Design a protein around this ligand. Structure first.
Ligand code: MED
Lengths: 174, 5
C-alpha cells in the first residue's frame, strides 16, 4: 500500500477512505502566516510518516518530563504510569507518529530551523508545532495496515490554501 | 531539542 495523506490545516485526508479532524500550532499560532515561528502551524511541504509500531516512546529525562525522539509509531506513557508528567504528556496524547521532511523545499523551509514533527492524538485543540489528529485516525491506521502484507509507504503533504485558522475542532467536546 | 516535554 502507498498512501499520500493531505493536510490543509483543518482536515487530514486519507484518499479513498475519509477525512479526519486535525489541528496544528499552539493556540495563538494556528496560522499559515506563522508557520516559521517555533511551535506554530507545521511548515508546508512533504513529510514521510514512520508507521512502524515500536511500543512505548523513549523517555529522555523522566525528571524533566521529557520524551526522547523516535522514528516510528510509539505510545505515550499516561495516567499513573506517567506520574507527575501526566499533565505535560497529555499534550502528546496516547499515540504519535514521527514525520520527517522528504524533499528540498520542505527541508529548506524556515531556514531549516524547525523540526521534531509528529502526528499525535491528544484532544487539546492545539499542538506544540505538530499535527493533532482525531484519535480514530490511529484505529483506522492499525486496521488498514494489519490486513496488508507487503511494504507500507505513508507520506503527508501539508498545503494551506486558505489563511483561515489551522484548527480542525479537535478539542474534546461536550 | 525540538521539544522540552
Ligand atoms: C527548537 S525547534 C522549534 C520548536 C519545534 N517544536 C518546532 O515547532 O519547530
Amino acid at each position: 500500500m502507498a498512501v499520500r495523506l493531505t493536510f490543509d490545516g483543518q482536515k487530514l485526508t486519507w484518499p479513498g477512505i475519509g477525512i479526519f479532524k486535525a489541528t496544528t500550532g499552539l493556540p495563538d499560532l494556528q496560522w499559515p502566516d506563522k508557520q516559521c515561528v517555533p511551535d506554530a502551524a507545521i511548515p508546508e511541504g512533504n513529510y514521510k510518516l514512520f508507521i512502524q509500531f515500536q511500543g512505548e516512546a523513549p523517555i529522555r529525562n523522566a525528571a524533566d518530563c521529557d520524551l526522547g525522539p523516535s522514528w516510528g509509531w510509539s505510545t505515550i506513557p499516561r495516567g499513573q504510569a506517567a506520574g507527575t508528567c501526566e499533565i505535560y504528556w497529555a499534550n502528546w496524547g496516547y499515540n504519535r507518529i514521527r514525520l520527517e521532511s522528504a524533499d528540498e523545499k520542505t527541508r529548506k523551509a524556515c531556514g531549516g530551523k524547525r523540526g521534531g514533527f509528529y502526528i499525535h492524538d491528544s484532544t487539546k485543540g492545539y499542538s506544540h508545532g505538530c499535527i493533532e489528529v482525531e484519535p480514530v485516525f490511529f484505529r483506522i491506521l492499525k486496521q488498514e495496515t494489519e490486513k496488508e502484507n507487503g511494504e507500507k509507504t505513508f507520506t503527508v503533504n501539508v498545503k494551506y490554501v486558505s489563511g483561515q485558522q489551522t484548527n480542525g475542532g479537535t478539542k474534546q467536546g461536550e | 531539542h525540538h521539544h522540552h516535554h
